[PDB]
Write an enzyme that holds these catalytic residues in place. Structure first.
Site, mmCIF file in Angstrom:
data_model
loop_
_atom_site.group_PDB
_atom_site.id
_atom_site.type_symbol
_atom_site.label_atom_id
_atom_site.label_comp_id
_atom_site.label_asym_id
_atom_site.label_seq_id
_atom_site.Cartn_x
_atom_site.Cartn_y
_atom_site.Cartn_z
ATOM 1 N N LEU B 11 0.830 -1.199 0.000
ATOM 2 C CA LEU B 11 0.000 0.000 0.000
ATOM 3 C C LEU B 11 0.864 1.248 0.000
ATOM 4 O O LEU B 11 0.475 2.280 -0.553
ATOM 5 C CB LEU B 11 -0.940 0.014 1.203
ATOM 6 C CG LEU B 11 -2.063 -1.021 1.203
ATOM 7 C CD1 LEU B 11 -2.639 -1.141 2.607
ATOM 8 C CD2 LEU B 11 -3.152 -0.686 0.171
ATOM 9 N N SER B 15 9.648 5.857 5.414
ATOM 10 C CA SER B 15 11.075 5.764 5.757
ATOM 11 C C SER B 15 11.422 4.481 6.515
ATOM 12 O O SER B 15 12.482 3.890 6.295
ATOM 13 C CB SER B 15 11.494 6.989 6.576
ATOM 14 O OG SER B 15 12.763 6.810 7.167
ATOM 15 N N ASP B 127 4.948 15.778 14.178
ATOM 16 C CA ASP B 127 5.045 15.546 12.729
ATOM 17 C C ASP B 127 3.696 15.594 11.992
ATOM 18 O O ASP B 127 3.428 14.751 11.127
ATOM 19 C CB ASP B 127 5.807 14.233 12.410
ATOM 20 C CG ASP B 127 6.531 14.262 11.025
ATOM 21 O OD1 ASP B 127 7.090 13.221 10.603
ATOM 22 O OD2 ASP B 127 6.550 15.322 10.350
#
Ligand SMILES: Nc1ncnc2c1ncn2[C@@H]1O[C@H](COP(=O)(O)OP(=O)(O)NP(=O)(O)O)[C@@H](O)[C@H]1O
Ligand SMILES: Nc1ncnc2c1ncn2[C@@H]1O[C@H](COP(=O)(O)OP(=O)(O)NP(=O)(O)O)[C@@H](O)[C@H]1O
Lengths: 308, 268, 325
Positions: B11, B15, B127
């Protein structure tokens, strides 16, 4: 008909909800009436499970209809949840199959059973819900022919954000057993989702189960997913009625209200009350609860230091 | 097969690891597995620790708008709830690279809900970005990738923080300077402001090298709301209350064709 | 027939059912007229299968406001048939969410007629309408200004009775509304918990002693969640400074039920992790230090959870490192 949380528990008449629930016949001591008590040790449920159970109660108090089993009382006893319901003396249609009609039921009997189911689903679909557990084990035949749809626990509402959604995308919790009865588009869990027309697929499945005496697809769950993604299979009308329920495209499956109008239901003359006890002919229900026959191994269906 | 899970197609691949679709073989629930090469983690500085840490957080977090961790299996595999697409993928699928206001607004309110939840748990996400915001088939936004998040102490008075490690573009001027202590929440807010800036315009508020540009503090053309989120001063910068009460947030925008989501189990 | 027509008939027919005592013939016609029109309203608001008509909805909302009918339908919900009560709630839920620009007109309506909220609240006491009152109150309280009106009211404290109701369907509904009021609008509930601390927790204290298993378990889970929400920081530091709360948590560790004791464990951890314990709290832990170390070490050794094992470990260490300042 008020009830207080004081009940003589008797026969195990069924089980469910991952085996956390026992179903009992019971005698309500005040009045002498025989009813069903459904019991779940909450000590064994997650906080979530309790909430899921709390949802079933809400929805049941919402529903009011002649082919829906009504709930009469709900309360906590010690660490268990009890839901009191009327006793359906014939048991469920799965009882009748497993217990006597192992090779399936008579087609007229199926016509009444499916009729009651379609009426109830028409009502719940109109109330903006999807049942999600239509199967023979969720079909109760009254002490005198009245057919009831049960299994409200699985009922998901399609009214969301105070608006009505065209489709839902919710994969039903606690549904391992139900898997065979679920529509392909319930199970594939993609962007199209599903709607009320998924229970009509299950009607077709339940149709084959009543007619055949064994569920479509006992095999492992992944194998039946591969097949769902083929379809199971009497009067010409009945075959065609099944063929309509089981269509791959939901949009081509007809609704509960227009399923009512199928030629399969033309064979119904009397009302299920004046004909169904006769159709479940060899099987006589139980009347005398004042006997050892409720403690018979057969069961009652299919009779023939801190320091502060 | 892995436990009761059988595997599907790729999918995505960020990283840390490759992400494949999975299928629960007992229940038949569509799920997803983050697959992490034990050896490849060891050579990502703090890779092992980030993972154990995320697993710790997701295990005690529960909200409609936070990604759900379902299982953890070994020999490493994080079984996650399934999402059809991540936000950046949708932006990447259309030439415009942005959403119509009505679509973007729903996503943005869903995002505020998740952030409010997480902050209230003392989680500073660090993030927030479209690649980290996933979508269920029912269009529910799920904040994912708690990899570099800082759990604040239930007895810390402030949301005071020390480390950066979020994605470079979405970083505020507090971080493009060092500083040493800053409000953690207001870092999330600047990051929300950069994602909202993006999903709405298609562009990024800063190019790059990168840090020198952010630590200097321009709008194209909602504008008031964007200046507030993207304030250089953290004191003047909007709190989550001020975002909720701002007219752009409160307004129901008239809904035009939105980005539909861009165009796995049978063989197995 | 138009929205204004539907509203007018509804207003009129309801007047009829309310009327002191009349002929049976007219009660049947009015009952039918209440059901028939409520169906048409729902169907305007929700559409059929014809999506909701943008313009008719605007009209129907404006008529509802002017008619007073919205207040009438709540007050006299008892006079309405089974299916009509469900429709009342559905209609109510829908106009509630009506939104023009930055404004939310129905919230504004109710803010000028706050007795609607209290009537809905009082619904938990009449079995035949409790569910639909609950459905409507829960919807209302999604809106911050309506939640405030309830939280700030004297009748809020009636929830403490409503959640100990022997009918679990209604008890669970009432607690869900209660949980919601306390947790959805986070800045509001901290304001509320700061201000009304003493009375709230004197009533909350009672719930942690309920003979209802479900009540105890749930009030305890909810307390842990309240205490760990950062918005409630000040409330936590107060809660964890009172010996009686510590005694209670410590006593719930030994309870009959594996589930209650686990919940108490999750409040109890907050007491211990505190860097700034007051002297009597400190003292209890000191008096019981060895016992606590033995207890926590054996505590529900029957899970391997891992996070839980890590939590016990962290606590035992916390307890061992205890001293006097
Ligand atoms: N009112 C009733 N009268 C007679 N029999 C009943 C009644 N209610 C339940 N039963 C029996 O008990 C069984 C289980 O009840 P049910 O409500 O189906 O629980 P369940 O949790 O759905 N079980 P499962 O199908 O395994 O999920 C039914 O199939 C009937 O055999
Ligand atoms: N739960 C999920 N369900 C479906 N797809 C996902 C899920 N999580 C991530 N993905 C996809 O996989 C891509 C990479 O995931 P990422 O969050 O970067 O994981 P990682 O830490 O790199 N391993 C994302 O951009 C998504 O498109």
């Amino acid at each position: 008909s008020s009830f207080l949380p004081c009940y003589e528990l008797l026969t195990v008449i069924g089980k469910g909800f991952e085996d956390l629930m026992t179903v009992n016949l019971a005698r309500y001591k005040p009045t002498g009436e025989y009813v069903t008590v459904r019991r779940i040790n909450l000590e064994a449920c997650s906080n979530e499970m309790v909430t899921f159970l709390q949802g079933e109660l809400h929805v049941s108090k919402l529903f009011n209809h002649p082919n829906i089993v009504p709930y009469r009382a709900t309360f906590i006893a010690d660490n268990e949840l009890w839901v009191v319901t009327s006793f359906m003396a014939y048991g469920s249609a799965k009882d009748l199959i497993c217990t006597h009609f192992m090779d399936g039921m008579n087609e007229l009997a199926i016509a009444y059973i499916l009729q009651g189911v379609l009426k109830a689903l028409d009502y719940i679909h109109h109330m903006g819900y999807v049942h999600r557990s239509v199967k023979a084990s969720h079909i109760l035949i009254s002490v005198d022919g009245k057919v009831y749809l049960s299994g409200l626990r699985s009922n998901l509402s399609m009214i969301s954000h105070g608006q009505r959604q065209r489709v839902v995308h919710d994969f039903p919790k606690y549904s391992v057993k139900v898997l065979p009865w679920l529509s392909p588009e319930v199970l594939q869990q993609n962007l199209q989702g599903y709607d009320a027309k998924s229970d009509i697929y299950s009607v077709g499945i339940t149709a084959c189960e009543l007619a055949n005496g064994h569920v479509p697809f006992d095999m492992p769950a992944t194998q039946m997913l591969l097949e769902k993604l083929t379809v199971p299979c009497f009067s010409p009308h009945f075959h065609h009625f099944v063929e309509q329920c089981l269509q791959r495209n939901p949009d081509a499956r007809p609704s509960a209200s227009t399923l009512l109008n199928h030629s399969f239901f033309k064979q119904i003359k009397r009302r299920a009350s004046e004909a169904l006890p006769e159709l479940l002919r060899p099987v006589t229900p139980i009347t005398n609860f004042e006997g050892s026959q409720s403690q018979d191994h057969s069961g009652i269906f299919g009779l023939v230091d801190w320091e502060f | 097969l892995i436990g009761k899970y059988l595997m599907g197609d790729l999918l995505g691949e960020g990283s840390y690891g490759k992400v494949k679709e999975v299928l629960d073989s007992e229940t038949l629930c569509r799920r997803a597995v983050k697959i992490l090469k034990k050896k490849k983690l060891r050579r990502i500085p703090n890779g092992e620790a980030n993972v154990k840490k995320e697993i710790q957080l997701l295990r005690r977090l529960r909200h409609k708008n936070v990604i759900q961790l379902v299982d953890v299996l070994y020999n490493m595999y994080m079984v996650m709830e399934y999402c059809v697409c991540g936000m950046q993928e949708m932006l990447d699928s259309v030439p415009e690279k942005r959403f119509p206001v009505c679509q973007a607004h729903g996503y943005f309110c869903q995002l505020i809900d998740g952030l409010e939840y997480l902050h209230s748990q003392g989680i500073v996400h660090k993030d927030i970005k479209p690649g980290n915001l996933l979508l269920t088939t029912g269009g529910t936004l799920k904040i994912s990738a708690l990899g570099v998040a800082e759990a604040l102490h239930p007895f810390a008075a402030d949301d005071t923080c020390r480390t950066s490690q979020g994605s470079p573009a979405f970083q505020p001027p507090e971080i493009a300077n060092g500083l040493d202590t800053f409000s953690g929440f207001k870092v999330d807010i600047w990051s929300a402001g950069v994602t909202l800036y993006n999903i709405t315009t298609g562009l990024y508020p800063f190019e790059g090298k990168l840090f020198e540009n952010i630590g200097k503090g321009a709008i194209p053309g909602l504008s008031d709301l964007l200046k507030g989120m993207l304030e250089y001063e953290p004191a003047k910068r909007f709190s989550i209350r001020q975002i909720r009460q701002h007219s752009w947030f409160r307004k129901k925008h008239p809904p035009e064709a939105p980005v539909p989501i861009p165009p796995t189990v049978v063989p197995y | 027939k138009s929205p204004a027509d539907i509203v007018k008939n509804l207003k009129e027919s309801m007047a009829v059912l309310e009327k002191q005592d009349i002929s049976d013939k007219k009660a049947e016609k009015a009952t039918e007229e209440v059901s028939k029109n409520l169906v048409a309203m729902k169907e305007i608001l929700y559409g059929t299968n014809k999506e909701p008509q943008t313009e008719a909805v605007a009209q129907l909302a404006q008529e509802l406001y002017n008619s007073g009918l919205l207040s009438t339908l709540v007050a006299d919900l008892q006079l309405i048939d089974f299916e009509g009560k469900k429709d009342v709630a559905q209609i109510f839920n829908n106009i509630l969410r009506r939104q023009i620009g930055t404004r939310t007109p129905t919230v504004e309506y109710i803010c000028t007629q706050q007795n609607i909220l209290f009537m809905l609240l009082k619904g938990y006491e009449s079995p035949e309408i409790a569910l639909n009152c609950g459905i409507m109150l829960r919807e209302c309280i999604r809106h911050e200004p309506l939640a405030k009106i309830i939280l700030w009211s004297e009748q809020f404290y009636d929830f403490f009775r409503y959640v100990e109701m022997s009918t679990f369907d209604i008890a669970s509904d009432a607690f869900a509304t209660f949980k919601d009021l306390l947790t959805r609008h986070k800045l509001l509930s901290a304001e509320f918990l700061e201000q009304h601390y003493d009375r709230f927790f004197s009533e909350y204290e009672k719930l942690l002693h309920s003979e209802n298993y479900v009540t105890k378990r749930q009030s305890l889970k909810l307390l842990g969640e309240l205490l760990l929400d950062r918005h409630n920081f000040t409330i936590m530091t107060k809660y964890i400074s009172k010996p009686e709360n510590l005694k209670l948590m410590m006593n719930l560790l030994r309870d009959k039920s594996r589930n209650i004791q686990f919940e108490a464990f999750h409040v109890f951890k907050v007491f211990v992790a505190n860097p700034n314990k007051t002297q009597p709290i400190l003292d209890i832990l000191l008096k019981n230090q060895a016992k606590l170390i033995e207890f926590l070490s054996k505590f529900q050794n029957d899970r391997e959870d891992e996070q839980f094992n890590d939590e016990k470990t962290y606590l035992v260490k916390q307890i061992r490192d205890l001293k006097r300042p």
